[PDB]
C-alpha cells in the first residue's frame, strides 16, 4: 500500500546502518518486482529513495550487502519505472563506475 511504500522510503533515508538499509531495499525490490499494480511506479520518481544507497554503498565500500542488493534494487525501479531513466539525467554514472572501481573484484557483484 502506499502507507507501506512512506514506511520503506522513511526507513530507507532514515537509518544509516548496512544492515537495516540493505533489507528494507531488498523488500522493496520485492515489492516492485510483483505484477499486481504500478504501485512502486507512484510517478514521484524520487531519487531520495536511492541516493543515499548509492551513496552508503560508495562510501562503505567493504558492505557487499548493499554492494549486492543496490544493483538489484536500481535495475528493478529502472525496469518498473518509465520515468527513471528521465529522472536520471536532467550524476549516477558516477556512482555506478566508483561501485564498479571499488570492491567490484568478485562475479556476483561484476554480473
Given at each position: 500500500?502506499?502507507?507501506?511504500?512512506?514506511?520503506?522510503?522513511?526507513?530507507?533515508?532514515?537509518?544509516?546502518?548496512?544492515?537495516?538499509?540493505?533489507?528494507?531495499?531488498?523488500?522493496?525490490?520485492?515489492?516492485?518486482?510483483?505484477?499486481?499494480?504500478?504501485?512502486?511506479?507512484?510517478?514521484?520518481?524520487?531519487?531520495?529513495?536511492?541516493?543515499?544507497?548509492?551513496?552508503?554503498?560508495?562510501?562503505?565500500?567493504?558492505?557487499?550487502?548493499?554492494?549486492?542488493?543496490g544493483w538489484s534494487?536500481?535495475?528493478?525501479?529502472?525496469?518498473?519505472?518509465?520515468?527513471?531513466?528521465?529522472?536520471?539525467?536532467?550524476?549516477?554514472?558516477?556512482?555506478?563506475?566508483?561501485?564498479?572501481?571499488?570492491?567490484?573484484?568478485?562475479?556476483?557483484?561484476?554480473?
Amino acid at each position: 500500500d502506499e502507507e507501506t511504500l512512506k514506511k520503506l522510503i522513511v526507513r530507507l533515508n532514515n537509518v544509516q546502518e548496512g544492515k537495516q538499509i540493505e533489507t528494507l531495499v531488498q523488500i522493496l525490490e520485492d515489492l516492485l518486482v510483483f505484477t499486481y499494480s504500478e504501485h512502486a511506479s507512484k510517478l514521484f520518481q524520487g531519487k531520495n529513495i536511492h541516493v543515499p544507497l548509492l551513496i552508503v554503498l560508495d562510501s562503505y565500500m567493504r558492505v557487499a550487502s548493499v554492494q549486492q542488493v543496490g544493483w538489484s534494487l536500481l535495475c528493478k525501479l529502472i525496469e518498473v519505472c518509465p520515468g527513471t531513466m528521465q529522472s536520471l539525467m536532467g550524476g549516477v554514472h558516477q556512482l555506478i563506475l566508483k561501485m564498479l572501481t571499488v570492491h567490484n573484484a568478485s562475479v556476483n557483484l561484476s554480473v
